[PDB]
Symmetry: D2
Subunit: 356 residues, 4 copies
Amino acid sequence: AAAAKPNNLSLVVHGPGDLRLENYPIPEPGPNEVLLRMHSVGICGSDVHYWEYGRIGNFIVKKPMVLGHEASGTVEKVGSSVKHLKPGDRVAIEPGAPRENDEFCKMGRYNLSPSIFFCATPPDDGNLCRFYKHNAAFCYKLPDNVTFEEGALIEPLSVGIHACRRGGVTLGHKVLVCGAGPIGMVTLLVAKAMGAAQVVVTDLSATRLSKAKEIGADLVLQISKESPQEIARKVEGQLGCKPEVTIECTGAEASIQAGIYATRSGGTLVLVGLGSEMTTVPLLHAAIREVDIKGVFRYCNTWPVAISMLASKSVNVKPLVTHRFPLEKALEAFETFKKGLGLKIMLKCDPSDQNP
Amino acid sequence: AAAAKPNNLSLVVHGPGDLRLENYPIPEPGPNEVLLRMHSVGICGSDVHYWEYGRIGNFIVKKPMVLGHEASGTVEKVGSSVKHLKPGDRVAIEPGAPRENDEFCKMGRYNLSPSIFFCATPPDDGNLCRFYKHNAAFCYKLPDNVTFEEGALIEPLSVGIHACRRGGVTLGHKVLVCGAGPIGMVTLLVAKAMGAAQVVVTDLSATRLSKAKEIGADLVLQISKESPQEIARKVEGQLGCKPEVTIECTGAEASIQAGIYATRSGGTLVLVGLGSEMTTVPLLHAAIREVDIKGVFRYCNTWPVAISMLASKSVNVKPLVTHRFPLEKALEAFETFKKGLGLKIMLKCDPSDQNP
Amino acid sequence: AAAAKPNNLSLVVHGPGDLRLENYPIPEPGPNEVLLRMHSVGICGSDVHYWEYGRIGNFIVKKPMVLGHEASGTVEKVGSSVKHLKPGDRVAIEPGAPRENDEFCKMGRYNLSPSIFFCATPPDDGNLCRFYKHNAAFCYKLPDNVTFEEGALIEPLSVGIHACRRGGVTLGHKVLVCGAGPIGMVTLLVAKAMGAAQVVVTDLSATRLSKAKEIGADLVLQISKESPQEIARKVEGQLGCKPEVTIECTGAEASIQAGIYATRSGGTLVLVGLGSEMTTVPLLHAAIREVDIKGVFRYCNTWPVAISMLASKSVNVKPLVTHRFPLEKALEAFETFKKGLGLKIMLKCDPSDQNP
Amino acid sequence: AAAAKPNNLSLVVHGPGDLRLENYPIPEPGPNEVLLRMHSVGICGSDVHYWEYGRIGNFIVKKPMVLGHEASGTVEKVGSSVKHLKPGDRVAIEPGAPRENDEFCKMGRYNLSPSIFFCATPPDDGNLCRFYKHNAAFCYKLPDNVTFEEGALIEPLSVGIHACRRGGVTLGHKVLVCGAGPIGMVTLLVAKAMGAAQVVVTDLSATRLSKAKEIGADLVLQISKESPQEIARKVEGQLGCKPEVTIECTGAEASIQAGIYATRSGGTLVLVGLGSEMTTVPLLHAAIREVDIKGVFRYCNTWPVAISMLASKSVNVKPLVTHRFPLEKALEAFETFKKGLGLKIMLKCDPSDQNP
Ligand SMILES: [Zn+2]
Ligand SMILES: [Zn+2]
Ligand SMILES: [Zn+2]
Ligand SMILES: [Zn+2]
């Protein structure tokens, strides 16, 4: 008989609480695509949320969907039109690839393209599996001194890069980060790398703040039941001034309100967290002091920069990885994520190499 | 006996509903100030509001305050250090003058300076009187082909200039302006002067919209009881697309919500109207499509630009003046403003010249 | 016998002074391309230059090349993947279409993409012919109230739009335009549309300046043998101040030098003309007054905006068309261009419709 | 007899090669000025050049001028209107203080103000003396953990901050710095602090490059007689790509040419060095790839940011000081500067404290 064919075991969400490991066909790359032997894939709240509620806002799972969107792997095969990538190349994968060159792509903000393909956001299948095909322009070669897990960490790191950019974070800035979860952490890492003089991070958990301290947070503030004004007051009390930029990573109404009150006049409040459809905020306060309120939707043009920072050892994201499981233990990985302990959980999809 | 001294009759608000015409001492200009013989002064909701409620937000009249802040006049005397102005110069007066060169002034956003002096905003006396002294750097010479009233209109025009600038209005844009009151009208004139392809104005009053058409509105939409989503749909229906910029001039929650829904992704929603301390809005919607929410606080660096536009006949604000009264008929002018009929009302403070 | 097949008569440059009208095969559109029945094509110095010297700098004609790059036409057929365009649509054609989604395209500056395809720039064939295929994303639908010739004029107009953008031209600006040739003219049109208060245009020809006056130039200055300093002096003498932006459209060294001397501190000097490989300029002068020197290479993201301006009658480019010949009289059209009289010469490729 | 009066020994340049130490009257601070007891003052090519040639470009010493402009000191007395400073405050002095609030100051670019006062640039006296008065808004309080010498180093550091800002240096960038002199070194430190992934420094001296390595240069390239094109090739060869930003610090024509050839398309070439009045450069090359050429004139809005960076230990400029002499040994200090050996030389003006 013929030799055994390769498999494409995949982690699939069928509905709320219905997670399964099942085999999928092996993708065939189009002329401008590459087939990747998946290596490392980190998971975040969006994967867990789809698993728990089968949806996130209007993005709802209407049919079985493969999870995973923060990954790296090895090029297995390339399409006829691919020139910059060859079999064997280690690459980082940017999950958002435009389907059409609309005005948003031409102006340089492809992340806003309405018909964009995005891994693990229904109805687009993610990459928590063995073999995955992706647009070649959105697969970036990893330098030899950058690990697969670092390559996978580029996705969450890019959320922080995009956020700091939109906020205008720069040399000597005093930056406030609301939330010490993984989003706030990468945001902290980026702010410092961009030259922020002081970064103050707030959170409900003293443990998370302790970890924030470990990776660079200049100041931490544990929040309990203080009002938004009191929070802003305490923040300013610690800095000796008002932060020029605030990056809200919790999505909670009270925190958003605190950011408006805390941010220096002419500064920027970036909203990265996702909360309710409606939020009650002191717009009048913001307008009078020209505190801009800018939202963030994923990212654009961050991979090459993230790779340069990692290759030059300008940032250290490794401490963010707290657990790693082989793809086959995906369910245990998700149950672990739910326990709220840790920061970034990594899934190892390549049986031939389970290392970082 | 000696010759009669000049007088300095002033319109003063002593408290809610307490408006009086009384004589004030004649100001003496310091080294970097000039004394102006007031000529034309337009009034707006702010003056009228301080009269009715004795306050606007946290800005409250604690002692009698002279009203007026949109003016022009003639230089009567100059301080020992003034060199760009001499007696007889016709000038436009920018009401906001910084008291100290703090970081806001140095960075170029002096309007945000915390200790800024501003005419007719408690506790700073306005210029609805005969003689007024002001910082010479904030008094701009008017070209011969620009009238005193045009000079006075620079103040309200600058609100529109600052708003369109913050919104990023530029060549070819489709702009939505919520509110056809005087603020919306100047915003309309400025947007067109900046190259906007089409400006659509909304309002509750059919009469105000008709006037909007008269000065350049490409499209108008009268609003009754439609929902924010409906408003957004109607606007897009008329433009054939979503406007890149929305300038909200009413301050109403419903209108602000319509702006978020209507604005094109990656676009900007400018908040010029002043409403409630709190506003319930769909921030999530705005964040997902990166629709920025920028507030505005008066203006900075608009006088020279305004003068060049008027001097070159690039914009015409004359149609905005619907009534003019001599200073002595100030009460009648304020009663007229309440009638809600009309656009801009001008007060003439110089008895020797009541002309435009 | 079968019915007669359509022809694809094309204007081809074989070498210096070797211009021919010959039949080409009829292009077949790929999945993301459209086939256009060419209608109107304007010609400029680059077409004439390739004809005269068979090259422009390093861009050299190594094999017969079809000329033409400023055009519009009617969609004849669409590729399998085209959704936004159907047979019969009248469209404007943007000649520069990227071959790969490199970092320049992702950042929003696709014009800088190294491997970009560009009509009539060797070795890419242009569109002065009957049928031409082009990337569908770069073919824009023309509104009914916009003529084919206006659609073709979008290309040269876009040179002006891009130039004013890079220069930062905005409301109330005083702008200097060196050169009253067709480039300077569209630049003049754009500057005014963006809100420039005064535009001063210089040139060696009094006739060209007279035409500039006809289309909006606020001030004109005929240049003879004056030195760069004297030019700057005269320019400032006319404006009463220094222009915040200078757009050099001749490429001549002396003019570039005058622009540096004339431009206001902190302003911008945009280089649109093409001269020698080397230029001697007073960089020290520019640096001390922070006068930025920015080059321009064609354009990016201008078509939709140009179309909006034309459809709303915000700009009038029609006066630029001074002559029109059918494709078959292409040689006469080129000999006419060489006579230096006129501004824009239009070629009509569709025998069924030779109107504007 | 009465008590001995304090002295105000000053280092004065009377003409080419004529340097003297002589006593000056003690300044009396005006209402918005402060009198400083000078502590640390670093010197640079400008002071040394005024000494050797009695001029720099059009800036010429027409009467004896006190040298020095990179300093810090202690507040000895404050004007009747000063409120943010009191006797005893340790402060950093920003040498450039505007004499009038013109359009340049209002727009936020006060360094361009035509009538600005600037220490040690004829005809304005510098601060290499015992007592010096300055505008209070331009004297910044130093935190306790920042030394006087660090305060004095803010001046040269700000040249680098302004240069990197104008160049747009940001996260992940590959930056080329031409020249390893003190300007190139601070530029290097700032570029890294701003998040540049790799900074490559070029220079004629192998010794200066070794020092560059010591403070953070990722790569160094010694230049001998290669051509500009060759230099550009070598730089790219080492980076593996073209740098997005080039900061030219020598002022040499050949070097400026290399910068144009080396800089990535759409990138920026910042000219910090001062060379000849005229420079022959390949503008065409720069325009075709939209490589912007921006000059710089000192700085604006950098002191507060510099202080925050030093106070947070985000940058370390201490390694720049290679020698320190008391004011009285100024001649020896200037002779040492000519030796070309060393980086930054500090003069100690306060006899009661000669420490860093
Ligand atoms: Zn994620
Ligand atoms: Zn008003
Ligand atoms: Zn052309
Ligand atoms: Zn210096």
